Enzyme design. Structure first.
Site, PDB file in Angstrom:
ATOM      1  N   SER A  48       0.787  -1.237   0.000  1.00 10.01           N
ATOM      2  CA  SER A  48       0.000   0.000   0.000  1.00 10.01           C
ATOM      3  C   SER A  48       0.817   1.285   0.000  1.00 10.01           C
ATOM      4  O   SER A  48       0.211   2.363  -0.074  1.00 10.01           O
ATOM      5  CB  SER A  48      -1.025   0.031   1.132  1.00 10.01           C
ATOM      6  OG  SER A  48      -2.122  -0.837   0.856  1.00 10.01           O
ATOM      7  N   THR A 213       1.681   3.361   5.299  1.00 11.78           N
ATOM      8  CA  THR A 213       2.086   1.978   5.549  1.00 11.78           C
ATOM      9  C   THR A 213       1.794   1.081   4.345  1.00 11.78           C
ATOM     10  O   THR A 213       1.015   1.418   3.430  1.00 11.78           O
ATOM     11  CB  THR A 213       1.282   1.393   6.715  1.00 11.78           C
ATOM     12  OG1 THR A 213      -0.117   1.509   6.423  1.00 11.78           O
ATOM     13  CG2 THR A 213       1.623   2.084   8.019  1.00 11.78           C
ATOM     14  N   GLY A 214       2.389  -0.120   4.367  1.00 10.69           N
ATOM     15  CA  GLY A 214       1.958  -1.204   3.499  1.00 10.69           C
ATOM     16  C   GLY A 214       2.292  -2.526   4.163  1.00 10.69           C
ATOM     17  O   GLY A 214       3.158  -2.589   5.043  1.00 10.69           O
TER      18      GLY A 214
END
Length: 268
Positions: A48, A213-214
């Site tokens: 993401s 974030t991811g």
């Protein structure tokens, strides 16, 4: 003797030794241009974190008068995917482009990102946007959820820690975006709701931070941030990509916390 740069590199190496996998980091001082990192030129899957560049691509079109932030986009049942904190509440209705951008930034909303993609030319258009702002490495190829796929050597949907740090700097602090768009994108990152256990957890409460974030849920945890240590003349950009980790999900988050603690302890 051992200097502060040595200690910083050693901390990042120790974290990587504990997590398994590869930890790529890049810390970039936007004031002086000084830069330090680990695996900073290696490819990592974005997960993401690509949503940061997608929202920037949308704002670039806004800056040129080609897209309206108030354009209503229909949200259909067939657009639904697992993690959709805003869009899942509007199935059968619509949301503005600005509302979709907010949702994909601060809640990592997956249908929101997929609905914005065609407005900037789909993954090929997002890649052209990146080349146009001077990022020669980062590339977008797939929509959610398929973009999360990665194996060693898979080039699709990757960045490098150093390229992403430079792209943070260009988009948030350079002139690729107009002032209203830089402010809007920065405010979304500051308002992020998904990063409380990652880089943010390693910084004192008085440091301003925006982040995206991811994660892939199994072995990869990433966080990219703009950080203002109090009183410093200019912010730092910090990228952290953990890929192939063999520790559990909480330990993967805690590894990114530790990346930020290293910057807190040694650079601030």
């Amino acid at each position: 003797v051992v200097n502060v740069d040595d200690m910083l590199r050693a901390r990042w190496a120790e974290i990587q030794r504990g997590t398994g996998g590869r930890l790529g980091t890049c810390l970039l001082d936007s004031g002086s241009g000084w830069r330090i990192g680990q695996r900073e030129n290696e490819r990592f899957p974005m997960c993401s974190t690509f949503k940061f560049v997608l929202a920037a691509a949308v704002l670039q079109r806004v800056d040129k008068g080609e897209l309206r932030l108030t354009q209503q986009i229909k949200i259909r049942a067939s657009d639904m995917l697992e993690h959709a904190p805003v869009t899942e509440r509007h199935v059968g209705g619509s949301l503005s482009v600005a509302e979709l951008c907010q949702a994909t930034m601060i809640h990592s909303d997956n249908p929101a990102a997929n609905l914005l993609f065609p407005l900037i030319g789909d993954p090929p258009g997002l890649t052209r946007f990146l080349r146009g702002i001077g990022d020669t490495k980062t590339r977008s190829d797939r929509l959610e959820p398929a973009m999360n796929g990665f194996a060693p050597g898979e080039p699709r949907d990757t960045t490098t820690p150093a390229a992403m740090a430079a792209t943070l700097r260009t988009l948030l602090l350079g002139d690729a975006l107009q002032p209203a768009s830089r402010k809007q994108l920065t405010a979304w990152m500051i308002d992020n709701r998904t990063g409380d256990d990652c880089l943010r957890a390693g910084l004192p409460r008085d440091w301003k931070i925006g982040d995206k974030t991811g994660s892939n849920g199994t072995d990869t945890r990433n966080d990219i941030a703009i950080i203002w240590p109090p009183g410093r003349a200019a912010p730092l950009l910090l990228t952290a990509y953990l890929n192939g980790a063999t520790v559990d999900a909480a330990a993967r988050d805690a590894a990114l916390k530790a990346v930020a603690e290293a910057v807190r302890d040694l650079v601030g």
